[PDB]
Structures are given as structure tokens and as C-alpha cells.
Structure 1
């Protein structure tokens, strides 16, 4: 038999265990390993999971086949093979790739569906085990763990450009015009000492030609250690993850990705020309699988029922921060911002941007930043920042030599942005934010490097009052202390002030004391509400209608009677489109525009605000 070196386990036996997993292993085995028999379905269980997966790979036309170490453990012989893989991940992965190819050929013949066995041979099946082990940081990874299968979660610090890889060397003889191809094993090309052609009779006549040499796609992605894995006292250590073929560019940089792989250690040459290599070995992880960290039909039905409920707007507001008290209007504005307005692009007038930015000002103990962290959790992509920690250059763009790097707002783009101590945030940073928010995109010019980075990020800001506690005598805008251009740029302005009464104090103290009374203590689940916002954006594309247009023109003229920025009217339209997404209405309606204007009026306590100078009586706040 053929045995992997040092394992005393046959490579044929590993392939046979993988074949028993691919066929003659029921999905019932994986479901039983998962237990939860009430959750498992008997018919899909009786069907063979890996047989269905190989047939699905044939239907896709792709050689790659996702692998589950849990399913490998579910099958008994495949569990033994998975332990052998944990010992020798690369060898067992090659064995499983060959087994997947052979099982695909056998499955094509068995199903009798049209397919080419030669096409299956040309295809190189891929085994991508996952759930082999608990996710761990790069700092947790060890040289003993090198050459052992593991599943790792990490946030991509950056993704490197695709790196050419010498899949096979090609030798072309300059003396005799001979053509040859030499496979590259272990990353080293093989060169015959004499000419491949005996008639040439020229020693070392063969010459490698790089263009003729076969190249396989390869890439690397820097991966930061997971925030839980990182030590509390120090920033996480980062190790780049090797990737190739379909795994290359599987996940974009700046988004969390879970890549199962085998850790690798390689000697580092003391000098590139010198054969000598330092006793220390550089360490990198080669990913057997790449994964992240879209609405299911049942989730979409649940979102539809929720959106049908009239209580759902306030329900999602409360669901953003279920434990928090008395900031439901700010949470509703944040939920509208998470839904976002629809974006319209035109040849003239540029492109109206649907993304909504929300500014919130609260006196200390407003729980505004607790709600902001709640919004960061609720957002599908979360960016949280402190005003003292915020920098304008970091928010817009950085340069490394000389190539531009994504700003903090650019990384926020594609998700909601959370800002704490927004009053403490620098006015210069806010001035940088003004242009980026007005354009919904960032443009940067600098010596050497000048480029524009997308900044289409919904922005949430939690701000202190300009006074240490919010002053009713102070104007609400002054208490928020936001610059007027940034306030116009923001779609929504939120004002929250504490109101004191004996019964209200009893209620607040009772809430805090109940959370304390538990030793560990209508709201949608936060993940379900993120999915609801995603489904609202996906299946709802609100646009200005006639009724919404009557409401919008009335609101614009009335706010001009009250001065109305044209951007505020666009922000009201975006909030109206956000409300239609919150209601899962395909187009903006008069009720949506009315709710958007009502949400803006309630957010800044404009109804509470006194008619003159914009100041709000404290009793008027919180009605």
C-alpha cells in the first residue's frame, strides 16, 4: 500500500475513508453527530450528504467541494481519516482531493447525467475542511501546531495582490529548440543535467522559460488575531494566510473571515543569494478553507410579518437596544439609517445619495453610546469610534510607501458608522467629514498620491452636550456642538435629555435594579433585525411617489417657513425611503415621508423645542 510518510497510515486507506464519507455515509450520520434529532430532517438525513454535495459540485461545474470536519467525524472511518488529517493536513487534503475527484467520476457514471470523466480529471477537486477546531488567534498558534489542521478566525488587516505561483516549470532548449514541461514539486523546479533530446547531445541544454512555465493562482491575506484572542494589554499579532485558486480573494479586506488551514513554518534564508538560512523559521498559515467571519425564505417571511405589524417600527427601535431605556426615538432613527434611503444617479444633478447619517446629542448617562454600541452590533458591518480617538486623516485616507489606504469612514462604508464623544471630536475632523458626507464619498489629494476612496457609510454619532449636562436654555444645535455644515450633511439630528420625576425615577431605578436582581440578566433578535434591514434593502427599493411627493413638497415648504436646506429635503426623502424599507414598502409613500418628517421632528425634540432661537424647554423634552 501507499502510506503517508511518518504516519504509518495508508494513503489508500485515507482515500478509502474519504470515499466512504463521500458515498455510503448518510447525512443522517452528520445529523446524528450534531444530535438535535428534532431539528434534523429524516429524508435529507437518509439521503447521503456528501453524495448530494458531489452531485451539487457536478451541477456547479466546479471541482472544489466544501468539507466539514464535523461530517468527517460523523462517519466513523472518515473520523479516523480526519484524525490522520489533523496529524498531516496537507497530505490528507491531497488524498481527499483525489478521493473527491474519483468519487465525482463514479457519481457521474452512477447518476448517468451527462458529464465528462476527462473534464473531472482536468478538474482538481478541493477539500476544504471546517470546524476542525475552535477558532484561535495567530498569537495562539504554535510551532507544534504547524503542519496540523486547525480552524482559525481573523479580521483581515489587508489582502495582498494575487501572487503568481509556479505550478509547473517549462524547459525550452535554446540549442535544439526542444520543448518540455517539468512539474514543480515543493516549490522547486527540476532541471535535467543533460539535454532532454538525445540527438541534441548538449549537457544542460534545457533552459526554463517563465512564460512557457505553468502558473497557478496564489494570494496571501494578512489576518489580525481575533479581538477575543488578542491580549487585553496589547494589540493583536497578525499572520498572513496563504491562499490559492478558488480560495484566493474569497473575502475582502476589512471584513472578518474564518479560514481553516494548516500552520506552516519555513526556513528563512540568511541572504537571498546565500544558501544559508537562519535557524528561526518564518511562520504562515495555509488555508485549506476560506470563509467569512442574503435572507433565507423563512427569515424573509418573518421580516414580512414584522413589517406588516404597525408596532414593528418601535419594536425594531427597542430591539436595537432592548435593555436600554427611554431612547426609542433615537433607536428608530438609527434603524431608519440602517435601512438606508435609496440612491438615485442622474446625468444632471449628480447622484442623490440614499445613505442616512444620524447625529445624536445626549447628556451624560443618556445611554447614548450604549445605544451606539447596540447599533454597531445591529449593523451588518460595524465601525465604532471615539471623538477623542478620531482623526481626520485616519477617517479619510492614509498613504504607505506611495499607495493610498482606506480611511476610517471608508472602512465604515458598506456599514453603519458609530461615533462616541462626538462633541469631543475635533472640529477639523468634522470639517473633513463635511465634504465626505455631502458627497457620500471621499476624495483625497496629496503630494505623490492623489485618489478618491468610497465613503458611502451611514453615520451615527453620540455626542456630549456642550455643557457637561444638557442645558434647556442652550439651543439644541449648540448643545450638540456640531458644525453647521456637518449638521446639514447629517440626515438626522437627535436630542435626548433626562427628565426628573419621582415616578420616572422609580421606573429607571427599577429597571437597573431588576438587571442587578438577576444574577445574570416586542424586540426582534439583533441578528434577525440585521437580517430584516438587509432584506429591506434587498427586496425594497423605495422611490419618490406622488403621495410621498405631496408630503415632501409640503415638508420642504413648511420647513422653509420654519428655513429648509435642500439637503434636508433629500435627507427627508432618504429617511422616507428608509421608512418604506422599515415597512417593507416597495416605493416611498406619503405615510413614509410623514413618518420621516415626524421621525426627524421627534429625534431633535423639535416638537419639544421652543419656537424662538431653537432652545428646548427641559420639560418639553420627553414631552
Structure 2
């Protein structure tokens, strides 16, 4: 007696699918998911009786936002919806459209059933999307086969590049040449359903409608190239790749170099032999049409900031695996904090170098600060394993080097003695001006590098000679060496009272399981976010008398500027908003140790 709305080719009723989804999208409780998964005894009513997707839709509607994330296992946890999971996997676009429409209907019905007043016109105007994810096993890109050609799949891989956003027409806009009447036409399966005659019966001219391109409505499309991860490849051949299409607010979900998951329908389409013909090649382009993407506190901060031993505590915590080099550790901690910037340029960078014998802990020290710092890099003074120090013009494009890439982070450079001369010259304007000047291919700019450098350098030959000065042992020239705030020597000279305890400390790491090593990054982050020290007036006189003292003892104003920056860094430590006399005194003292080399 009535028509039926059926998912084509399946005999699934769309009313049944709709209500099966509705009765989960409302009245599901998160406790059921722990029944499906392992560790079911961790169910807890005071956290798990929540109407999980009512909670999601409420926060979502208070944010007015269109998208819902949906772990597909939650369908299998709920009795009226376990079949909907199979329909979702096997017939995804229809089921997903049904789920989208159901989310919009839930939003509409909530503001009249839960009946709090809201802009019904806003919800009416808005589109809504489900993002199903964790659909199933992350089957290999190399394992896909033509049975997948309409199923919802899951992939993992590496983003190589993405197009700019591509406008994709959703509604064509037509205008009549004779009578200027206008009509909107939805694009159906990518085809413009052109009106052959003008709509208005009082005009009805044939072939008179014309497309007004910049009055059409466009969705956003983007194409991204995903390479097979080397974890999955067989050893003797190239990795594969798959192009994936991604739309609207999922555009620019990822960038070049991102390792990601995607959940998406595997799709295929024919391609033409030549554009002037309908003739199609007998095997289709394949792509995945994605619906979800994913990559790969203050109380304690203030509590720890009250401590008296904080300087030593934090300094030892940067590398507790390494035997005692404690003034180096203190210097590198102060480098992590850094000074302050000013408008007028003078900036907050602090720069450190380690020299002495090659076969010693300095490399591990650079590695540890690299692991700690938010956005630093590790490199060495010459060559390029597809990563190099200086900015460089190549094909035409400008590439930014490791110094420039380390903007706002510590740049760790090993083999700093063996650095090439053009690089040795280039370091001057980042040391002084924190920038590098580019003047080629019609582009002129001072490309701002804004990086603190931790250098690791070596003597000539196998051993450092401490009876000779640093300039006599090291290759790199004094005017560059002068720019470093703190400069250190680490030596392998035999002493059992050091070597035995080093060996016992080292060997004990294989047996054993205060050291806030994981809280260190959070402390550094909140300090850099919140604290901007200013110099006390008494600290002016302290800086002046200390500088004239070391001047009476070959100093330069670069040492005074260094003492300022170190004192400001010392004031970020302890979360102090104004540089104290003790901050100046420790900056002075540590520099007095360093300048004696």
C-alpha cells in the first residue's frame, strides 16, 4: 500500500537503519563499551552511566559545531545497533548519510523535547556530520583488492604532500540571458543538470540559461598522497602510495611528513583516454574518500617553585643518567630558560659550547636537551643527510636550514669544530642578529632564525691538551668562540675516584628501574609562557660592579649582555618576575667560571 525506502542492492530498510541508529545516538551509555572490551571489571557507575552521545551532542551544540567522532566499536557494544555496524562497513555512504541526517534530527528534536530555547533557524541552516573511526583492522595499503571497492576501510601511512584546496561545485547557479531570471541546480553525481528551457512559463526560451560560475556554491576538496609506511613494506621493492580525497573542515587535517590513520570508503572511478572523448580506460583509478583522520599542572608548578634546592634539582634532572658535570648541567638548564626580548634587536637566546675529548658524554648531553626542548633540532656542523645547517636555494625554491628550522628551540650541533667555512661565516648574523640574509631569485629578506645553539666540538686529533688554550686545541676561530655565553671542557683524563664512580653509575642503569624528568618539560613550558623578568634597580649596580671587576681582572660588553641574559633566565627559574641580586650573582659566578676556561 506504500513505498519503501531501501538501501539499494541490500533490502535494508532505511527506516529501520534510522531508528537503530537513533536508539544508540540517544540512550547509549558508556558502561556498555567496557563490557565489549577487555578489563570489564573497571566499569564504574558514577563515570559510566553517562548518556555518552547526549553529552557529546550537548557540548557540540554549545559549541555550535557540525562534527561528531564515533568509535565504531560502540555500535557493537549496543544490542539494537550491532547490525548497523555491519551495514556501516558494507554500505557506508548510505548509512553515513542516514547517520548525518539523524544527528541533525537529534539536534532539532532536543531543543523542542529537552525544550530549552535555542536558534532553531541556526540548526536548520547547519549541516551535520558523523566521523566513524576505528572501523576495523588497519589492513595494508598493499593488501587492498577489488572486493573493497565500496567498503569503509582503515589505513595507516605517511603524508607526502597535499594539493591546495580545490573548489568542488555543490550547486550550479544559472541565469537566463533574455529575462535575467535565476535558478539554483544541485550537482548530482558530479553532473550539471542543465535546464534546457527557462523555468518561467512567461519566458520559456530554449537554450537561454547560462552558468554564472562565481555565483555557484562550492564545497572544499583536497587530494593528499599517502605513502605506505616502511613498517609494512616487503624488503625488496618500493613502497606503494594511495591518493586520498578529503573534504570541508577535514581539509588540512595533516601536513607533509605526518604519519596518520584515515578511516574512509575505498572508492574507484574510471579515467579518460583523451578529454575530447567519452572513451574510458578499462581499469579504474582507486582512492579512499575519508571520513575521519588522526595522527600517529599549575598547582604542582607553584608547589615545586617554592623549593630552595630547585636550581640543583632541575639541573641534575636534565640528564641523571650522566655522571657529574654539574656546572654544565646548570648552564644548559639556564639555556633552556633563556632571557627576554625587547622592542626598539636584543633577544632572549643563550648559547653554549662543549669541547674537550671526543669520546665523552657531550653527545648524550646534546641528545637529552634535544629530547627536552619543544621545537629544537639535532644536526652536525657539515654536510646534509637531506638536512643541513644553512638556508639554501634549490629546485626553484628556498629551503630553510636546521638553524632556521630551530626557530624558538635549541639547535644542537655536533662536530662543531669540523664545520665548513661558509657555515662558520653564516653563524655570525644568527649569533648577533638572530637572522640570516637572503638576496636571490627576486626575494630579499632577513630570514629570522631565533635559535639558541648548543654546540659540541672537539680537539684536533684524538686527545685534548689542557696545557694549551682552547683556541690552540680547537679548530674553530676565536671570534666565533667568543660569541658563546658559556663554554665548557669535558675530558677523559684518568682518575679512579671519578672513573670508578662513573662506571658504577653507568652499570647500575642496567639493574635499577627526586628526579622530575617528565615534569621538567611542563615546568619549562609554563615558565616560558608566564614569566618575563625585568631587571631590579639594585641589580643595575650589581651588574656594573661585577662587570668592572672582571674588566679589571679583559672583558667586553658582550659579557655584560650575557650576564643580563643569564640573570633573566635565572629569574624565569623559580618563576620570579623580577631579576634579583642573587640572580645577577649566579649569572656572574657561572660566567666567571666559564671565561677562565
TM-score range, shorter chain: 0.7 to 0.9
CA shift, 1:213, in A, is 0.7
1:145-200 Cα distance to aligned partner (Å, 9 max, x none)? 77655666767666654332323222223244231222234444332444444554
Distance 1:65 1:232 in 2: 40
1:19 equivalent in alignment to 2:13: no
Distance 1:253 1:480, change over 3 A: farther
Query: Is this contact kept in 1: 2:402–2:411, CA < 8 A?
Result: no
The Cα of 1:437 is off from its aligned counterpart by: 3.9
Structure 1 residue 68 displacement after superposition:
3.9
Range with greater deviation from structure 2 (75-84 or 183-192): 75-84
**Structure 1 contact 383–416 (Cα < 8 Å) conserved:** yes
**Alpha carbons 1:55, 1:107 under 8 Å: kept:** no
Q: Is the 8 A contact 2:378 2:412 kept in 1?
A: yes
Q: Which range moves more in the overlay, 353-362 or 284-293?
A: 284-293
Asked whether the equivalents of residues 380 and 415 of structure 1 are also in contact (C-alpha less than 8 Å), the reply is: yes
- Structure 1 distance, partners of 2:196, 2:572, is 70
Aligned counterparts of 1:416 and 1:426: Cα–Cα separation in 2 = 21
The change in CA–CA distance for 1:267 and 1:392 in structure 2 (over 3 A counts) is: closer
Give the distance between the partners of 2:451 and 2:143, measured in 1 at CA: 34
Indicate how the Cα distance of structure 1 residues 405 and 363 shifts in structure 2: closer, same or farther if over 3 A, else same. same
Unmatched segments (≥5 aa) in structure 2: none
Q: Which moved more, 1:447-456 or 1:79-88?
A: 79-88
Report if the CA contact (8 A) 1:436-1:443 is conserved: no
1:36 Cα deviation after fit: 7.0
Deviations along 1:350-385, one digit per CA (max 9) or x if unpaired, are x32223333333522323222322222222234222
With over 3 angstroms needed to count, the CA separation of the structure-2 counterparts of 1:24 and 1:536, relative to structure 1, is: same
- Residues 254, 411 of structure 1: 8 Å contact kept: no
Q: Deviations over 1:265-284 (max 9, x none)?
A: 55554545554555666565
* C-alpha distance 282-555 of structure 1, shift in aligned 2 (>3 A): farther
TM-score by length of 1: 0.79
- Structure 1 contact 387–426 (Cα < 8 Å) conserved: yes
CA shift for structure 1 position 598 = 4.3
Q: 552-561 or 169-178: which moved more?
A: 552-561
The structural deviation recorded for 1:538 is: 1.7
CA contact (8 A) 1:154 1:256 kept: yes
Deviations 1:561-608 (A, max 9, x none): 45445444444433333333332223333333434444555668xxxx
CA–CA distance in 1 between the matches of 2:143 and 2:565? Answer: 46
- RMSD over aligned CA atoms reads 4.2
Taking a change above 3 Å as real, the CA distance of residues 206 and 534 of structure 1, as seen in their structure-2 partners, is same
Q: State the distance in 1 between where 2:241 and 2:483 align.
A: 37
Residues 502 and 488 of structure 1: CA distance in aligned 2, closer, same or farther (over 3 Å): closer
CA distance in 1, matches of 2:454, 2:133: 36
Q: Which moved more, 1:321-330 or 1:253-262?
A: 253-262
1:289 to partner: Cα distance:
3.6
Helix, strand or coil at the partner of 1:139: helix
2:473 alignment partner, one of 461, 470, 479: 479
Q: For 1:541-570, what per-residue CA distance to the aligned partner results, in whole angstroms no more than 9, with x for missing partners?
A: 223333554444445444444544544444
| 2-structure distance, mates of 1:60, 1:402 | 44
Once the two structures are TM-superposed, the CA of residue 430 in structure 1 deviates from its matched residue by: 3.2
Which range moves more in the overlay, 359-368 or 563-572? 563-572
Do the aligned partners of 2:321 and 2:506 also contact (CA within 8 Å) in 1?
A: no
Say if 1:203 and 1:142 are closer, same or farther in 2 by CA, change over 3 A: same
Distance 1:603 1:203, change over 3 A: farther
Preserved CA contact (<8 Å) 1:175 1:205: yes
Evaluate the alpha carbon distance shift between residue 253 and residue 201 of structure 1 in structure 2; reply closer, same or farther with a 3 A threshold.
Answer: same
Displacement of 1:400 in angstroms is 6.1
Give secondary structure in 1 for the equivalent of 2:147.
coil
Paired with 1:145 and 1:416, the residues of 2 have a C-alpha distance of 47
Q: Deviations over 1:95-131 (max 9, x none)?
A: 3332322222223334433312221121112333455
* Greater Cα shift, 464-473 or 5-14: 5-14
Measured after TM superposition, the shift of residue 52 of structure 1 is: 1.7
Distance verdict in 2 for CA 1:365–1:283, change over 3 Å: farther
Mapping of 1:356-375 within 5 angstroms? 356-375=350-369
TM-score for both structures, normalised by structure 2: 0.82
Q: Distance in 1 between matches of 2:146 and 2:552?
A: 71
Using a 3 Å threshold, how does the CA distance of structure 1 residues 387 and 161 change in structure 2: closer, same or farther? Answer: same
Give distance in 1, aligned partners of 2:329 and 2:28: 49
Give 1 or 2 for the bigger CA radius of gyration: 2
Give, in angstroms, the shift of residue 212 of structure 1: 0.9
Structure 2 Cα separation of the partners of residues 411 and 417 of structure 1:
9
Is residue 392–residue 433 contact of structure 1 (8 Å, CA) maintained in 2? no
Q: CA deviation at 1:23?
A: 1.9
The size of the alignment, in residue pairs, is 594
Deviation at 1:401, TM superposition (A): 6.2
Deviation of residue 211 (structure 1)? 0.3
Q: Which has the larger displacement, 502-511 or 485-494?
A: 485-494
Give a deviation string over 1:509-553, Cα, whole Å, max 9, x none.
2234334457xxx96565432222212212222233335544444
| CA distance 1:410–1:39, change in 2 (3 Å) | farther
Deviates more, 1:378-387 or 1:543-552: 543-552
Contact 1:267/1:282 (CA < 8 Å) preserved in 2?
yes
Alignment partners' CA distance in 1, 2:195 and 2:437: 55
Q: Deviations over 1:24-60 (max 9, x none)?
A: 1224345666777898875343332221221111111
Change (3 A) 1:353 1:113: farther
